[PDB]
Amino acid sequence: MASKPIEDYGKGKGRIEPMYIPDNTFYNADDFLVPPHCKPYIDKILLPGGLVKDRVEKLAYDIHRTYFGEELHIICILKGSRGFFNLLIDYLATIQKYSGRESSVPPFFEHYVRLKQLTVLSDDLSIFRDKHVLIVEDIVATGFTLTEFGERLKAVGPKSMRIATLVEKRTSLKGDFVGFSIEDVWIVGCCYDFNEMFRDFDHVAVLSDAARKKFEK
Amino acid sequence: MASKPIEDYGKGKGRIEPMYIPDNTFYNADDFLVPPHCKPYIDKILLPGGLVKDRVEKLAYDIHRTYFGEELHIICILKGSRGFFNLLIDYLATIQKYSGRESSVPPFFEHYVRLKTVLSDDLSIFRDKHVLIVEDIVATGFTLTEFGERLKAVGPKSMRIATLVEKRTSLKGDFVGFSIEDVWIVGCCYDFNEMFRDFDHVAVLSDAARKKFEK
Amino acid sequence: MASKPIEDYGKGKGRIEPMYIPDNTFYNADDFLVPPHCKPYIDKILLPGGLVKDRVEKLAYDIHRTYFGEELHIICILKGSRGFFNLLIDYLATIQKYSGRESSVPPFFEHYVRLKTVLSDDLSIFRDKHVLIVEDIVATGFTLTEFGERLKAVGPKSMRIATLVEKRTSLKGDFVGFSIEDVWIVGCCYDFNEMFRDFDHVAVLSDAARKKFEK
Amino acid sequence: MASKPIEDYGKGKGRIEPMYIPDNTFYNADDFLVPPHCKPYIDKILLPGGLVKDRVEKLAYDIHRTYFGEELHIICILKGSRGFFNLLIDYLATIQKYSGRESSVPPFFEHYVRLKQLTVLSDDLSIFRDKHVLIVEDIVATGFTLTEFGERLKAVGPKSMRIATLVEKRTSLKGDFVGFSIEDVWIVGCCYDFNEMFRDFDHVAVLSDAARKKFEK
Ligand SMILES: O=c1[nH]c(=O)c2[nH+]cn([C@@H]3O[C@H](COP(=O)(O)O)[C@@H](O)[C@H]3O)c2[nH]1
Ligand SMILES: O=c1[nH]c(=O)c2[nH+]cn([C@@H]3O[C@H](COP(=O)(O)O)[C@@H](O)[C@H]3O)c2[nH]1
Ligand SMILES: O=c1[nH]c(=O)c2[nH+]cn([C@@H]3O[C@H](COP(=O)(O)O)[C@@H](O)[C@H]3O)c2[nH]1
Ligand SMILES: O=c1[nH]c(=O)c2[nH+]cn([C@@H]3O[C@H](COP(=O)(O)O)[C@@H](O)[C@H]3O)c2[nH]1
Ligand SMILES: [Mg+2]
Ligand SMILES: [Mg+2]
Ligand SMILES: [Mg+2]
Ligand SMILES: [Mg+2]
Ligand SMILES: [Mg+2]
Ligand SMILES: [Mg+2]
Ligand SMILES: [Mg+2]
Ligand SMILES: [Mg+2]
Numbered sequence: 019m020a021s022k023p024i025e026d027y028g029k030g031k032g033r034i035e036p037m038y039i040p041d042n043t044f045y046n047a048d049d050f051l052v053p054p055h056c057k058p059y060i061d062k063i064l065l066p067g068g069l070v071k072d073r074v075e076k077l078a079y080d081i082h083r084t085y086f087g088e089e090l091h092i093i094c095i096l097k098g099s100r101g102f103f104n105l106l107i108d109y110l111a112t113i114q115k116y117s118g119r120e121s122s123v124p125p126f127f128e129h130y131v132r133l134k135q136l137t138v139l140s141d142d143l144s145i146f147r148d149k150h151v152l153i154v155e156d157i158v159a160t161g162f163t164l165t166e167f168g169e170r171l172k173a174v175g176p177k178s179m180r181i182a183t184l185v186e187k188r189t190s191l192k193g194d195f196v197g198f199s200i201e202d203v204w205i206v207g208c209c210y211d212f213n214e215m216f217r218d219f220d221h222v223a224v225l226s227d228a229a230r231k232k233f234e235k
Numbered sequence: 236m237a238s239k240p241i242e243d244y245g246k247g248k249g250r251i252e253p254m255y256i257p258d259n260t261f262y263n264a265d266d267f268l269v270p271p272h273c274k275p276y277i278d279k280i281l282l283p284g285g286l287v288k289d290r291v292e293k294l295a296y297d298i299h300r301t302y303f304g305e306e307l308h309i310i311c312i313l314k315g316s317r318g319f320f321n322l323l324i325d326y327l328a329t330i331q332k333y334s335g336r337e338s339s340v341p342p343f344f345e346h347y348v349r350l351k352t353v354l355s356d357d358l359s360i361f362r363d364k365h366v367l368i369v370e371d372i373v374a375t376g377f378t379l380t381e382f383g384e385r386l387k388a389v390g391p392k393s394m395r396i397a398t399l400v401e402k403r404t405s406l407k408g409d410f411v412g413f414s415i416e417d418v419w420i421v422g423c424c425y426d427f428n429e430m431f432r433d434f435d436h437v438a439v440l441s442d443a444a445r446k447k448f449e450k
Numbered sequence: 451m452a453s454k455p456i457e458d459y460g461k462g463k464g465r466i467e468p469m470y471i472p473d474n475t476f477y478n479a480d481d482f483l484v485p486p487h488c489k490p491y492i493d494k495i496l497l498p499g500g501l502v503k504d505r506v507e508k509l510a511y512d513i514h515r516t517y518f519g520e521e522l523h524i525i526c527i528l529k530g531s532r533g534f535f536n537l538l539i540d541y542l543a544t545i546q547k548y549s550g551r552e553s554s555v556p557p558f559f560e561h562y563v564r565l566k567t568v569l570s571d572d573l574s575i576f577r578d579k580h581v582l583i584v585e586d587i588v589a590t591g592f593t594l595t596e597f598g599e600r601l602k603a604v605g606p607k608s609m610r611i612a613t614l615v616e617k618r619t620s621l622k623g624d625f626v627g628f629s630i631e632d633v634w635i636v637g638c639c640y641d642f643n644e645m646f647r648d649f650d651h652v653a654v655l656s657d658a659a660r661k662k663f664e665k
Numbered sequence: 666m667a668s669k670p671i672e673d674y675g676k677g678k679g680r681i682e683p684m685y686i687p688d689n690t691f692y693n694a695d696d697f698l699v700p701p702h703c704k705p706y707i708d709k710i711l712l713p714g715g716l717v718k719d720r721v722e723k724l725a726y727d728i729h730r731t732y733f734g735e736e737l738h739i740i741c742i743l744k745g746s747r748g749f750f751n752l753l754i755d756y757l758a759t760i761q762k763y764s765g766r767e768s769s770v771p772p773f774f775e776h777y778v779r780l781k782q783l784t785v786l787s788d789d790l791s792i793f794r795d796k797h798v799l800i801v802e803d804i805v806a807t808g809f810t811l812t813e814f815g816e817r818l819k820a821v822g823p824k825s826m827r828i829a830t831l832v833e834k835r836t837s838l839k840g841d842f843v844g845f846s847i848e849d850v851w852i853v854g855c856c857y858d859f860n861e862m863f864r865d866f867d868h869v870a871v872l873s874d875a876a877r878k879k880f881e882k
Contacts, residue, residue: 037696049684051723053328054337068715072868076698079548096347104321111270111433116511116548120271124433130313132347132356139354218328218341221719254481266469268508285500289651293483296763333726333763436504485758486767528777536751543700543865552701556865562743562779569786571779648758648771 020088020150022178022194027168028161030192034080037073039064041201044224056219059229060207064200065222067208070184071105073197077182078109080195081152084180086114087121091149095167096132097217098156101209102184102197106154126152136166143174151176155183156209159202161191185222204230237305237365239393244383245376247407251297254290256281258416264438273434276444277422282413282437287399287423288322290412294397295326297410298367301395303331304338308364312382313349314432315371318424319399319412323369343367350378359389366391367410370398371424374417376406400437452520452580454608459598460591462622466512469505471496473631479653488649491659492637497628497652502614502638503537505627509612510541512625513582516610518546519553523579527597528564529647530586533639534614534627538584558582565593574604581606582625585613586639589632591621615652667735667797669825669841674815675808677839681727684720686711688848691871703866706876707854711847712869714855717831718752720844724829725756727842728799731827733761734768738796742814743779744864745803748856749831749844753801773799783813790821798823802830803856806849808838832869851877 022031044062052060094103107126114125129146132139151171158164164181168191171179181193187202206212206229207219215233216223239248261279269277298307311320324343331342348355366386373379379396383406386394398408404417421427421444422434430448431438454463476494484492513522526535539558546557563570581601588594594611598621601609613623619632636642636659637649645663646653669678691709699707741750754773761772776793779786798818805811811828815838818826828840834849853859853876854866862880863870 037692045684049723050719051332051726053332055339055341066713066716066719068717068719069713070715072697072713072715076696079698097345100321100345104317107433111435112544113548115268115270115435116545118549118551122272124272124430126433127429128314128317128432130347130349134356139356141349141354214344215341217345218324218343220328220332254477262469266508267504268511283498283501283504285502285504286498287500289482289498289500293481296483329759330763333760334765336765483762485762487769487771529775532751532775536747539865543867547698547700547867554702556702556862558865559861560744560747560864562777564777564788569788571781571786644774645771647775648754648773650758650762 020085020090020178022180024172024176024179027172027179028165028181028191030194030196033192033194033196036186036196036199039198039200047223050221052219056216059216059226059232060219060223061226062224063221064203064205064224065198065208067220067222070197070208070222074102074105074184075109077195077197078106078113081106081182082110082113082117082125085150085152086117086119087123088150089123090126090152091129091146092126092152092154093129093131095153095155096130098209098211099154102156103154106182131167133163133167136163136170138167138170143171146171146176147174148177150178151180153179153181155181155193157185157187157205158183158191158193159187159189165191237302237307237393239395241387241391241394244387244394245380245396245406247409247411250407250409250411253401253411253414255414256416261439267436270434273431276431276441276447277434277438278441279439280436281415281418281420281439282423284423284435284437287412287437291319291322291399292326294410294412295323295330298323298397299327299330299334299342302365302367303334303336304340305365306340307343307367308346308361309343309367309369310346310348312368312370313347315424315426316369316399319371319397320369323397348382350382353382353385358386361386361391362389363392365393366395368394368396370396370408372400372402372420373398373406373408374402374404380406452517452522452608454610456602456606456609459602459609460595460611460621462624462626465622465624465626468616468626468629470629471631476654482651485649488646491646491656491662492649492653493656494654495651496630496633496635496654497638499638499650499652502627502652506534506537506614507541509625509627510538510545513538513612514542514545514549514557517580517582518549518551519555520580521555522558522582523561523576524558524582524584525561525563527583527585528562530639530641531584531614534586534612535584538612563597565597568597568600573601576601576606577604578607580608581610583609583611585611585623587615587617587635588613588621588623589617589619595621667732667737667825669827671819671823671826674819674826675812675828675838677841677843680839680841680843683833683843683846686845686847694870697868699866703863706863706873706879707866707870708873709871710868711850711852711871712845712855714867714869717844717855717869721749721752721831722756724842724844725753725760728753728829729757729760729764729772732797732799733764733766734770735797736770737773737799738776738793739773739799739801740776740778742800742802743777745856745858746801749803750801753829778814780810780814783810783817785814785817790818793818793823794821795824797825798827800826800828802828802840804832804834804852805830805838805840806834806836812838
């Protein structure tokens with residue numbers, strides 16, 4: 019069932035809980051291949067990139083089970099969600115291609131919105147009126163960003179509104195498809211940045227004091 | 236060398252010529268796994284998805300040779316270039332990562348602009364930067380000519396274009412994957428009125444497809 | 451249906467015809483990223499690596515349709531079929547995993563035999579089993595005719611062949627990727643005296659290559 | 666330097682230590698997409714498949730640094746090492762293809778040996794005389810298997826002999842390139858089996874009592 023009353027947006031009603039990552043649990047950067055521009059600044063790896071992919075596969079499957087045979091409009095929140103969104107749509111298409119169930123509806127219709135008080139850079143949001151919408155976000159912390167953007171999308175009157183977020187911090191709005199629950203720390207790598215740096219690093223790391231001082235501004 | 240005169244933008248001066256795909260050269264869709272939503276509409280495949288990936292690896296290496304050791308700002312033109320851009324940035328990061336060369340600069344810095352008019356963040360941050368515009372296809376050359384003039388006003392250090400496909404139908408790219416005949420393509424992020432982006436291969440738009448998804 | 455009479459082995463009875471690659475149809479090596487050790491020797495690419503992967507996905511789906519819900523024993527013929535086998539088993543596991551169908555049987559059980567004569571574990575365990583022999587290429591058909599007779603003696607339940615390539619030069623496979631002209635291929639696990647297996651694309655053996663790596 | 670005196674075989678002399686996985690550290694199977702034939706039997710995931718790939722990348726790089734421009738003969742121990750070996754050779758070729766250093770020597774020359782008192786099913790081992798050999802193994806526990814096979818290969822007189830093993834158990838011979846150090850438990854998945862079952866599962870799991878009883882024989 020793709021239906022979900024608008025009023026439920028951000029409640030995480032009937033969700034599958036995310037993978038819980040306890041406090042002070044990290045891998046050492048030295049065990050991974052870290053590139054020279056990252057070497058001085060990465061010490062602790064919270065989520066290896068291949069752990070992120072394995073988790074995204076399970077989210078995708080959850081998503082496909084929810085919307086199969088229903089038109090689905092998926093919104094990528096740029097820039098941060100690029101990595102997670104591109105993995106997710108790759109899985110969604112593949113799952114639908116291999117599924118024994120056959121549908122005449124594509125697996126998803128993609129959209130982009132850039133968020134940076136919330137700023138909204140995007141096409142006219144009216145195209146989402148009466149559509150099933152899935153917001154793909156990289157990380158929710160206080161919930162402010164998705165609460166404001168959600169309020170603005172509700173105004174157009176979508177048919178349904180759900181949230182897929184790769185990480186939620188333990189500090190509030192909650193996503194419907196969430197990969198990981200982590201302790202309240204600043205993360206970089208795997209598309210997470212610190213003043214635009216580290217996005218190209220393959221793993222989700224903790225921001226180091228060395229990084230923070232070198233790239234603060 | 237990353238340096239290149241701004242006046243050379245769109246001239247494809249000194250480029251490596253793309254892979255030339257001759258007219259009326261196609262693979263049969265029946266030889267590929269085609270999902271149900273595309274099955275009635277896809278007959279001819281111009282570029283198998285795997286061939287796209289092999290060519291994008293060669294372009295990433297060409298781009299790595301050009302910009303290695305220099306700050307590189309890459310602009311994705313949405314929505315069409317999403318797939319090419321995502322493949323390209325993955326190969327650039329990997330190539331640098333395995334190169335055995337030491338650089339203190341990341342392999343790229345990413346940016347996004349949506350064209351259809353323009354929609355983007357403030358463009359003045361490209362001043363005195365090395366910029367690579369990544370696009371899905373160049374046909375008349377109008378889109379990149381127009382966006383190019385807009386960017387030239389902020390005074391970048393250099394401007395190049397990477398385009399997966401150029402049609403033989405005139406602006407040209409610097410890193411181009413394939414030269415094809417003048418036909419409307421769909422699949423691998425190419426669409427016909429927002430349809431077929433998710434198909435894994437580059438195909439020609441058939442009659443059946445044109446009819447059902449018409450204006 | 452997994453069932454198939456043992457007497458039909460090698461006849462390609464009821465198969466889906468492979469992708470036909472016409473004579474003198476090649477891509478230029480200069481359009482691909484070719485590593486230094488292959489660079490002097492590779493000129494023409496018959497099958498880009500990505501095209502191989504796209505076709506292997508279609509074969510895995512064909513094999514999934516045939517054996518789903520039945521115990522399937524897959525034999526890799528070493529060393530040549532390593533690459534095809536590894537791609538095939540990855541796609542079969544994934545296809546089953548995402549199929550949304552419930553089966554209590556794994557997508558395959560793997561086995562290995564080395565031919566050049568035979569080298570393998572005891573073959574009697576294939577008695578009353580559904581067997582799929584995975585091979586890199588069939589040319590005269592001698593290798594699979596001979597190994598086939600050996601296996602037939604243990605009384606399998608059914609026997610089929612998956613071959614990535616068949617040359618038009620006669621035994622034929624049941625799941626075949628490509629029909630090519632009669633030429634010696636190298637790359638993508640195809641070798642010339644143990645050379646070129648690691649190259650990512652299927653290429654023709656050139657003169658330069660023949661000379662340097664000769665008998 | 667590819668050189669290594671034969672006498673050092675199995676000592677792990679001058680190795681990079683593996684990634685240490687503490688006792689009683691597992692992920693829950695429920696957080697992953699587990700296929701129906703595995704669902705009843707997998708409970709605890711020790712090493713997510715994408716964690717294995719990220720670690721294999723770092724081993725490959727270590728291996729490339731050791732043998733670049735030197736002829737390298739790599740032996741896959743079947744059936745168990747298939748997964749690890751195929752990931753490793755894919756990385757090795759790619760690293761050499763992207764390397765700024767150029768060599769006229771291929772990244773590796775592959776070989777297969779099936780081990781099951783040790784049984785050795787293989788081509789004539791004499792082809793390894795005076796060659797640099799790397800044995801690729803899935804898991805070392807007591808060290809018996811690699812000690813016996815190593816003794817048999819020494820007899821032919823290779824130039825050098827090193828061991829790459831994805832996992833070593835904490836119970837003895839040691840590998841030169843080792844991915845993980847784990848507690849002494851029986852593992853399945855990601856090519857590890859229990860009486861031929863579970864190899865196709867994507868993650869390295871702990872054998873469950875339910876699995877053991879269902880597949881014992
Ligand atoms: O790179 C990042 N590492 C983090 O640890 C982190 N926490 C929050 N964010 C981003 O900052 C904002 C926080 O989201 P909230 O509005 O819910 O507080 C949004 O823009 C979030 O995407 C992060 N970005
Ligand atoms: O999906 C598509 N299939 C095509 O065959 C095709 N040809 C051009 N285009 C898009 O339309 C414009 C063509 O660009 P020009 O300004 O160079 O003519 C740009 O916006 C191009 O992306 C295509 N899009
Ligand atoms: O690398 C290769 N490139 C080729 O073009 C080629 N043609 C045949 N073969 C191998 O030689 C034998 C051919 O099999 P037949 O028994 O069917 O003739 C089998 O052992 C095949 O694997 C090739 N190997
Ligand atoms: O599937 C497996 N899960 C395990 O936990 C495990 N421990 C050892 N092995 C295999 O059994 C033998 C043990 O190696 P040792 O000779 O060093 O004891 C060799 O055949 C090893 O590869 C395992 N296989
Ligand atoms: Mg953001
Ligand atoms: Mg940010
Ligand atoms: Mg466009
Ligand atoms: Mg378009
Ligand atoms: Mg062979
Ligand atoms: Mg051969
Ligand atoms: Mg073994
Ligand atoms: Mg075993």
